[PDB]
Design an enzyme around this catalytic site. Structure first.
Site, PDB file in Angstrom:
ATOM      1  N   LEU A   1      59.332   8.197   2.410  1.00 37.96           N
ATOM      2  CA  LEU A   1      59.553   9.575   2.008  1.00 37.96           C
ATOM      3  C   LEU A   1      58.230  10.336   2.044  1.00 37.96           C
ATOM      4  CD1 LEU A   1      62.368  10.490   1.549  1.00 37.96           C
ATOM      5  CD2 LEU A   1      62.194   8.114   0.796  1.00 37.96           C
ATOM      6  N   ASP A   2      58.296  11.643   1.814  1.00 35.92           N
ATOM      7  CA  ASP A   2      57.116  12.492   1.796  1.00 35.92           C
ATOM      8  C   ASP A   2      56.744  12.831   0.355  1.00 35.92           C
ATOM      9  OD1 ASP A   2      59.169  14.298   1.199  1.00 35.92           O
ATOM     10  OD2 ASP A   2      58.169  15.951   2.236  1.00 35.92           O
ATOM     11  N   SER A   3      55.677  13.618   0.206  1.00 37.08           N
ATOM     12  CA  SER A   3      55.188  13.952  -1.127  1.00 37.08           C
ATOM     13  C   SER A   3      56.219  14.748  -1.916  1.00 37.08           C
ATOM     14  CB  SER A   3      53.874  14.727  -1.027  1.00 37.08           C
ATOM     15  OG  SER A   3      52.970  14.083  -0.148  1.00 37.08           O
TER      16      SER A   3
ATOM     17  N   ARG B   1      62.826  23.716  -0.925  1.00 35.44           N
ATOM     18  CA  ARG B   1      62.262  22.529  -0.294  1.00 35.44           C
ATOM     19  C   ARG B   1      61.935  22.799   1.169  1.00 35.44           C
ATOM     20  NH1 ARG B   1      61.713  16.759  -0.649  1.00 35.44           N
ATOM     21  NH2 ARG B   1      61.061  16.157   1.461  1.00 35.44           N
TER      22      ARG B   1
ATOM     23  N   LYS C   1      54.469  23.120   6.660  1.00 33.65           N
ATOM     24  CA  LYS C   1      53.897  21.818   6.334  1.00 33.65           C
ATOM     25  C   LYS C   1      52.627  21.551   7.130  1.00 33.65           C
ATOM     26  CE  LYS C   1      56.643  17.966   4.864  1.00 33.65           C
ATOM     27  NZ  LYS C   1      57.272  18.151   3.528  1.00 33.65           N
TER      28      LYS C   1
END
Ligand SMILES: CCCCCCCCCCC[C@H](O)CC(=O)SCCNC(=O)CCNC(=O)[C@H](O)C(C)(C)COP(=O)(O)O
Ligand SMILES: CCCCCCCCCCCCCC(=O)O
Lengths: 165, 122, 81, 459, 71, 173, 128, 111, 64, 86, 172
Positions: J40-42, K38, K45
């Site tokens: 997973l990511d942060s 999100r 990003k």
């Protein structure tokens, strides 16, 4: 006021104890069916503060609104009283919505319970108090001021209606 | 409300002043105006120790209210016709004040424009 | 005494208003992986709560029945006496 | 009063040739016996002061102070037992001698007949306390403490001596009975103002008064605990007993020159109470509290009303029992923590249950809960001051509110909260200091039942 | 833990509800219900007035006794 | 009662004998009846012991008397004997005068509750009687000061009496 | 992100709106290395006594004695007769006493001026 | 007047008895909460009776028994004025506290 | 029984010593207890003197 | 509050992590490294840690939130948070 | 030491979503808005040069600073919560047990027996741990508050007693 204000106080406390010492409304919900006795108690007391006809709040709040209206006050004195009745009722409905209605925004462990006998009995005597006392006391106490008989209708019915929008 | 508009947003002299009116002799306009009489004597109010604001003309019914009530003990669901006389007395007494309010109202209404009629004819 | 943990297979977006959340996010190329956490709250016995008028309406059915026979009893005195 | 004087001086030989360990037991028990004998002095006639002898007399003003001193004397005796253990026997007996000598001078001061005899023992109390403050103190500054306390009182004492001897040459006598009975109006001649002044600053320098109080924070916070109580409980009140006395002749001058001291005081307690709220040392608060409480007394005497005099007497006795308690309370904490910083030892209720109570009503008596004699003295001052001027009410009413502000503040910053985990020497509270607080507090509620004994001769 | 546990909490399921807390609950809400309709039927003249409010305008100048406008 | 109506006038008490026409009998009547014969009866006989024990050994206490002495007006300056006697006599008269104000306030206060809501009209007699006493008290002892004395009051009495003497001559014109 | 919150003395700029949060210069981030080191040892020495079982009683808090000593002793040795200090000394000195002197003198003079000819409400006041 | 005023004096002292037993350290600290329940509920129970004659005849009085201060012209004594307001508020207050601390026994028990 | 022992040692022995207190010591002092005059009715009677206070004449009788 | 022991806490976190649709039941392990074992990511790490935030009720400090990697040491962290021992 | 770039956003993202659920209240409404933000968080990003992300920081941190709820849901045990620092009035330091009268210690005999060996365990551990910590600490003192482990033989973790003998979070 001492009757129903207190009456909803431990009912809120009964919710707080049952729902792991939590106070914010934003974590309540779905408690109507899961918190039966308190649900009735808070529901009655919520607009018992607003005092529907033939109740502790009826013989006090509705007469209070008329009495100030049927008197000599400043123009803004009355308006705050109707604003009070409306504003009090609006959140009086709000706390029911967050608490019992909706969905249980509470942790997955379903500990919610009120089976304690002292819990029921302590509030139980305050149902009979918060509902019966206004009627019995009003006929048990002779009137002190001149009754408001010939009255132009609407400023009494206004107290009841300003509660519902 | 309506009279408030007729004085604040209208003419103050047109509406009666609650703390000053009446401003005309009640016997004037009613030749031989009979006096609103008393039923309960001074000692009746005194012995009953009635409070001053409820020591009005309706207090004659009020002492009857307490006396059935002071004798209706235990019961509190009795004592119905007693108030039915009392609040009706207060209902009609409030009408008497209301009639006096309208009397002074149309007293002010009539003379002001009657004087205005004089101001017009000169 | 049991503290048992029920099956997870019963708790995803289905059976909950989380249908819309799953698809409306999926409309903008998104995915909602935490709706399963709140599946039980939006389902099970906690769902289908009565309305506000229905909240106060609780006890009316027996209350109305008690009321009508009471005023029927009220008519009883004025007729029998 | 030699039925009190003779046993009191007889305490000296008994305490000076007792055994090396019985000095504490012997001194405590017979001092308490003297207190019981002194309790018989509560009897007062309608208005005639009890004239036992030519050189000794007492009334409803002297006796409550008299009992306060005699009742107090065992209290420092038990308080000093803690930190006087590490001392030689001869020096320990020297300490007891100073306390007994201080008591003996106090009884003679209150029971004195004429002003000059009153003045001699009045001032004579400086010597025993000077040794107590300086010799047995704790820190370097105590040397500067003694000089500050000595000169301040003396600087005002000497003008009174000149005025007093001037009274004898003019009126012909200095006896209080004759002075009040032969009282004559005092003219407003420019000399008479200084005549009035010279009889005043002597009493108000040791009250203390706003401005002339700096010795109070520099001594009470710094004297040994035993000397701290007697300084605060009685020694400040020596001005009160004198001022009710000297005001019998200094009239009608008080109407004019009360003003420069009145609002000096009236702005005083509000100012001082503000300093109490923002202290850093424990004992500094109670010392600053004492002058704040003493300030309303100054207004009570000076306004010259019967109600204020009763309020002055009641607040005088009530403050003595209080200020002694808080000073004892601070000593208990200072001993274990070896400092007096307020926030050094906050949150000790969890470890000190009975102390937390002893904090509780001691501060409440400082807040003056009803019907404690503190209010009975305080409220009487308010009614007298209001009758004098309506605008008075806001000031000292605001003061007793800022008085309320701090009077819970050390309660919050000493008992409420969490302990300090590095501190590990708070032992079990010894019954000695524990029972000391009991003997402080019970007479307060006992006098609350029948306050009629402490309103002075004007009741 | 110790003996005396009887109310058993659930995990993400609706908790058990003893009939005692239910039956009294709607009984009380019914008790607070039928009280006010019985009070309504018995004393409807309490919430709403029992004595009429005469309109001001309809009052003619007889009981008002206002002497005529023309003079 | 030990006190008499000349000192403490108690208005006569009337009893409005009831008439319970209601079907239900009154609950108060036997509630006071039971309270009577379950609490009062044990303490009545207990008091009979207390009253009979007092009769077994009844000692005596008298009232302290005070022979009147010459007043400060007739007393001598710088003479400490006679004027001390007048001083103490004046102080006692002050204490009695304080209690006179106490009694009239007690009588006045007792009036207010007796007339109930009719205190405004039925307590004027007691109020004015206290009013003149208080006014007489104000010119008597008020404003003297905390160090009040017979000579101080005499100066006030002389000051008031010379002011009215000047006023009387002014009124003569 | 909106009309920004203006910092105040009794409500300062937060840890978000502060420029230094996003203006981290090489030396500013470098500064948070040695202040951490001195705190590390300061925390260490405290633990070497707080966790010391041999240590009993109370350890000295240097900052506390520095605060008390500077708040009690080192004000006069650092005090200066600076005209500003005398200025705040004057207005907070004789100022308020002269304020309340005039207020109470004016009240007393205004009150007293009607007593000598009977213009006050005193009839029911025989206590003082 | 034999009931009512005397009954009020009985009501306000029986509530102090728990404190007197508490400070006497003879009371048992375990059932003291339940002991408090019985006191308040009883004190409420004797609070109803002072209403009964007030409904009946409406009598009101003032009880001043033990004279505290003479204070020259102003005597001071403990004194309760029982009027309409005070008389019927005591049962209202008494009933409220009995119920709320009845609830508090279950709630306020983990301390 | 526990309720009974509660009554005697907390309620019953009180009602005795208050009653002993006020009806022999407090009432023995003047004006210690003062009771308001009840609202005697013109039309009702006085118990001790047997005097029925004369009532007023017919009311307006404005039956709605 | 009933004596909530670590066994209940341990079951709840792993069930929720399996419940987490992006940590599938078959690929969830007791020592599930979100960056490495689960990839997973942060941001998902924030979502994971604050999921048990509302799911358990207590609070996770932020300086401890980013450190907390695996469900086993999630279990141990809540273990030392309340100090469970059974 | 200094808060790293991706660390600062993680802190801001933390309470921003707690702010979101404070705003959304409802779980489904929060879930819809949390996922939307999100992707909004994932919109950029990529940052490449650190200067761009610093500007992206400013807008982001300014967003979540205004994103606070007027009355955000602070948990009972959250800093400033209803149950936060509530039972501190009950926890008492462990050394107070030594300040017990022998009667109380005797009436709790097993506990004081195991307390004694715990007191003993503190002794050798403190001895070994201090001569463990002094040389484990490099010159210049401890560069950070992190404290070295019990990596030797038969040795206890240095500076452990107050951590191990911490007042339990539920003192009762
Ligand atoms: C209710 C509240 C409403 C109000 C508040 C609503 C939320 C406020 C934030 C709104 C969106 C915002 O653009 C997100 C920001 O932090 S943008 C600037 C920081 N980022 C960069 O400049 C690129 C560098 N990239 C990374 O740091 C990682 O890629 C990342 C952690 C982002 C992903 O995770 P990865 O696994 O490390
Ligand atoms: C629709 C409800 C009634 C109208 C709104 C409230 C009116 C209040 C009374 C009128 C204003 C006060 C003066 C008159 O009466």
């Amino acid at each position: 006021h001492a009757f129903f204000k207190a009456m909803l106080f431990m009912c809120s406390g009964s919710i707080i104890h049952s729902l792991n010492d939590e106070q914010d409304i934003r974590k309540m919900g779905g408690l109507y069916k899961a918190m039966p006795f308190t649900t009735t108690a808070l529901i009655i007391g919520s607009l018992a503060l607003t005092g529907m006809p033939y109740l502790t709040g009826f013989y006090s709040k509705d007469l209070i609104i008329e009495a100030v209206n049927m008197s000599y006050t400043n123009a803004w004195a009355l308006l705050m009283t109707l604003i009070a009745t409306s504003l009090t009722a609006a959140y009086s409905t709000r706390i029911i919505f967050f608490a019992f209605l909706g969905k249980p925004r509470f942790p997955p462990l379903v500990l919610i319970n009120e089976n304690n006998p002292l819990l029921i009995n302590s509030i139980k005597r305050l149902l009979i108090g918060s509902i019966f006392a206004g009627f019995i006391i009003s006929n048990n106490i002779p009137p002190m001021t001149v009754p408001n008989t010939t009255m132009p209708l609407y400023m009494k019915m206004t107290a009841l209606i300003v509660t519902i929008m | 409300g309506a009279h408030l508009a007729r004085r604040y947003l209208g003419d103050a002299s047109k509406e009666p002043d609650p703390l000053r009116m009446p401003t005309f002799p009640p016997d004037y306009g009613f030749p031989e105006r009979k006096e609103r009489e008393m039923v309960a004597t001074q000692q009746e109010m005194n012995d009953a120790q009635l409070m001053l604001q409820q020591r009005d003309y309706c207090a004659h019914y009020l002492i009857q209210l307490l006396k059935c009530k002071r004798d209706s003990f235990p019961n509190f669901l009795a004592c119905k016709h007693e108030q039915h006389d009392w609040d009706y007395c207060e209902h009609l007494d409030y009408v008497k004040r209301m009639k006096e309010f309208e009397r002074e109202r149309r007293l002010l209404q009539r003379k002001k424009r009657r004087e205005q009629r004089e101001a017009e004819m000169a | 005494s049991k503290m048992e943990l029920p099956d997870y297979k019963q708790w995803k977006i289905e059976g909950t208003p989380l249908e819309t959340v799953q698809e409306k996010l999926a409309a903008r190329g998104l995915r909602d992986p935490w709706g399963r956490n709140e599946a039980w709250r939006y389902s099970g016995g906690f769902a289908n709560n009565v309305s506000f008028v229905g909240a106060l309406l609780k006890g009316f059915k027996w209350g109305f029945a008690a009321f009508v026979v009471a005023v029927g009893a009220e008519y009883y005195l004025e007729s029998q006496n | 009063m030699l039925k009190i004087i003779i046993p009191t001086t007889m305490l000296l030989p008994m305490t000076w040739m007792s055994k090396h360990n019985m000095i504490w037991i012997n001194a405590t028990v017979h001092s308490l016996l003297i207190s019981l004998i002194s309790l018989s002095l509560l009897n007062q006639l309608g208005e005639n002061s009890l004239n036992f002898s030519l050189t000794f007399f007492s009334d409803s003003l002297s006796a409550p102070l008299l009992v306060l001193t005699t009742w107090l004397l065992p209290l420092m005796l038990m308080a000093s037992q803690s930190h006087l253990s590490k001392e030689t026997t001869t020096r320990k007996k020297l300490y007891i001698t100073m306390l007994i000598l201080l008591q003996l001078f106090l009884i003679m001061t209150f029971t004195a007949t004429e002003l000059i005899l009153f003045y001699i023992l009045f001032e004579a109390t400086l010597v025993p306390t000077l040794i107590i403050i300086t010799r047995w103190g704790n820190q370097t500054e105590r040397l500067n403490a003694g000089l500050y306390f000595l000169f301040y009182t003396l600087a005002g004492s000497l003008p009174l001596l000149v005025a007093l001897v001037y009274i004898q040459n003019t009126t012909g006598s200095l006896n209080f009975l004759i002075i009040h009975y032969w009282s004559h109006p005092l003219s407003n001649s420019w000399s008479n103002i200084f005549m009035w002044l010279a009889c005043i600053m002597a009493f108000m320098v040791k009250m203390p008064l706003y401005g002339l109080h700096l010795w109070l924070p520099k001594a009470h916070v710094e004297a040994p605990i035993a000397g701290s109580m007697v300084l605060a409980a009685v020694l400040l009140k020596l001005g009160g007993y004198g001022m009710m006395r000297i005001t019998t002749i200094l009239n009608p001058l008080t109407n004019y020159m009360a003003y420069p001291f009145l609002m000096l005081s009236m702005w005083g307690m509000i100012m001082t109470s503000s300093i109490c709220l923002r202290q850093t040392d424990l004992k500094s608060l109670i010392a600053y509290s004492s002058v704040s409480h003493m300030a309303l007394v100054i207004v009570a005497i000076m306004i010259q009303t019967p109600w204020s005099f009763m309020g002055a007497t009641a607040l005088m006795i009530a403050h003595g029992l209080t200020s002694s308690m808080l000073f004892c309370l601070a000593n208990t904490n200072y001993e274990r923590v070896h400092s007096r910083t307020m926030i050094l030892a906050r949150g000790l209720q969890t470890l000190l249950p009975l102390m937390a109570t002893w904090w509780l009503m001691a501060s409440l008596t400082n807040l003056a809960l009803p019907p404690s004699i503190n209010l009975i003295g305080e409220l009487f001052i308010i009614t007298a001051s209001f009758s004098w001027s309506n605008i008075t009410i806001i000031l000292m009413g605001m003061n007793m509110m800022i008085t309320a502000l701090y009077s819970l503040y050390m309660l919050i910053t000493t008992q409420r909260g969490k302990y300090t985990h590095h501190i590990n020497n708070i032992k079990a509270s010894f019954t000695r200091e524990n029972a000391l607080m009991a003997l402080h507090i019970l007479p307060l509620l006992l006098l609350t039942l029948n306050p009629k004994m402490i309103l002075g001769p004007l009741y | 833990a110790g003996g005396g546990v009887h109310i058993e909490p659930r995990y993400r399921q609706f908790p058990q509800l003893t009939r005692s807390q239910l039956i009294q609950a709607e009984f009380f809400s019914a008790t607070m219900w039928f009280w006010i309709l019985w009070r309504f039927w018995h004393d409807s003249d309490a919430v709403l007035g029992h004595f009429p409010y005469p309109d001001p305008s309809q009052w003619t100048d007889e009981e008002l006794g206002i002497l005529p406008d023309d003079e | 009662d030990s006190w008499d109506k000349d000192v403490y006038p108690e208005p006569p008490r009337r009893t409005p004998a009831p008439a319970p026409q209601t079907s239900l009998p009154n609950p108060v009547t036997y509630l006071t009846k039971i309270f009577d014969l379950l609490v009062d009866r044990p303490v009545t006989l207990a008091r009979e012991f207390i009253e009979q024990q007092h009769a077994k050994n009844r000692y005596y206490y008298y009232h302290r008397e005070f022979r009147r002495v010459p007043d400060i007006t007739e007393c001598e300056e710088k003479d400490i004997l006679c004027m001390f006697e007048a001083e103490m006599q004046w102080r006692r008269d002050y204490k009695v005068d304080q209690e006179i104000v106490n009694i009239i306030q007690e009588r006045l206060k007792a009036c207010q509750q007796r007339e109930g809501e009719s205190y405004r009209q039925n307590c004027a007699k007691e109020l004015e009687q206290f009013t003149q006493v208080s006014k007489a008290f104000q010119d008597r002892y008020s404003d003297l000061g905390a160090h009040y004395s017979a000579r101080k009051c005499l100066a006030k009495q002389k000051q008031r009496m010379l002011a009215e003497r000047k006023a009387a001559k002014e009124a003569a014109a | 992100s909106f009309p920004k919150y203006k910092p105040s003395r009794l409500a300062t700029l937060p840890a978000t709106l502060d420029p230094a949060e996003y203006d981290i210069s090489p030396e500013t981030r470098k500064a948070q290395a040695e202040r951490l080191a001195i705190r590390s040892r300061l925390k260490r020495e405290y633990l070497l006594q707080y966790n010391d079982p041999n240590r009993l009683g109370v350890i000295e808090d240097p900052a506390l004695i520095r605060w008390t000593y500077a708040r009690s002793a080192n004000i006069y040795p650092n005090f200066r007769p600076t005209p500003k200090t005398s200025l705040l000394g004057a207005l907070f000195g004789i100022g308020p006493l002269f304020f309340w002197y005039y207020v109470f003198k004016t009240d007393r003079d205004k009150k007293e001026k009607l007593i000598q000819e009977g213009k006050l409400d005193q009839t029911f006041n025989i206590s003082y | 007047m034999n009931p009512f005023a005397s009954l009020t004096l009985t009501t306000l002292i029986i509530l102090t008895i728990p404190i007197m037993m508490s400070n006497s350290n003879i009371y048992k600290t375990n059932l003291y909460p339940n002991y408090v329940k019985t006191t308040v509920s009883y004190a409420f129970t004797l609070s109803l009776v002072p209403l009964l004659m007030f409904m009946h005849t409406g009598q009101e009085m003032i009880i001043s028994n033990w004279h505290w201060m003479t204070l020259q012209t102003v005597e001071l004594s403990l004194s309760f004025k029982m009027d309409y307001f005070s008389v019927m508020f005591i049962p209202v207050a008494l009933f409220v506290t009995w119920s709320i601390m009845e609830f508090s026994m279950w709630y306020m028990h983990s301390d | 029984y526990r309720h009974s022992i509660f009554a005697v040692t907390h309620v019953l022995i009180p009602v005795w010593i208050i009653h002993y207190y006020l009806k022999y010591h407090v009432t023995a002092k003047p004006y210690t207890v003062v009771e308001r005059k009840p609202r005697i009715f013109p039309g009702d009677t006085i118990l001790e003197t047997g005097e029925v206070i004369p009532l007023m004449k017919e009311f307006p009788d404005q039956h709605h | 509050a009933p004596p909530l022991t670590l066994e209940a806490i341990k079951d709840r976190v792993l069930y929720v992590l399996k419940l987490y649709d992006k940590i599938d039941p078959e690929k969830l392990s007791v020592n599930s490294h979100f960056m490495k074992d689960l990839g997973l990511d942060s941001l998902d790490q924030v979502e994971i840690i604050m999921a048990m935030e509302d799911e358990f009720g207590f609070e996770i400090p932020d300086i401890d939130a980013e450190k907390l990697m695996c469900p086993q040491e999630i279990v141990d962290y809540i273990a030392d948070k309340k100090d469970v021992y059974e | 030491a200094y808060l790293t770039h991706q660390q600062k956003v993680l802190r801001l993202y933390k309470r921003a979503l707690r702010h979101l659920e404070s705003w959304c209240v409802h779980r489904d409404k929060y879930r819809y808005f949390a996922c939307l933000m999100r992707a909004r968080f994932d919109e950029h990003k990529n940052e490449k040069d650190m200067v761009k992300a610093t500007q992206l920081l400013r807008q982001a941190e300014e967003e979540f600073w205004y994103g606070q709820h007027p009355q955000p849901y602070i948990f009972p045990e959250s800093p400033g919560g209803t149950s936060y620092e509530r039972y501190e009035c009950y926890k008492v330091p462990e050394w107070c047990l030594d300040d017990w009268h022998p009667s109380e210690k005797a009436m709790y005999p097993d506990y004081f027996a195991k307390r004694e060996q715990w007191k003993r365990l503190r002794r050798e551990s403190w001895e070994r741990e201090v001569k463990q910590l002094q040389e484990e600490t490099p010159p210049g003192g401890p560069r950070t508050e992190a404290l070295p482990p019990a990596r030797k033989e038969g040795d206890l973790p240095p500076l452990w007693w107050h951590i191990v003998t911490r007042p339990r979070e539920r003192p009762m």
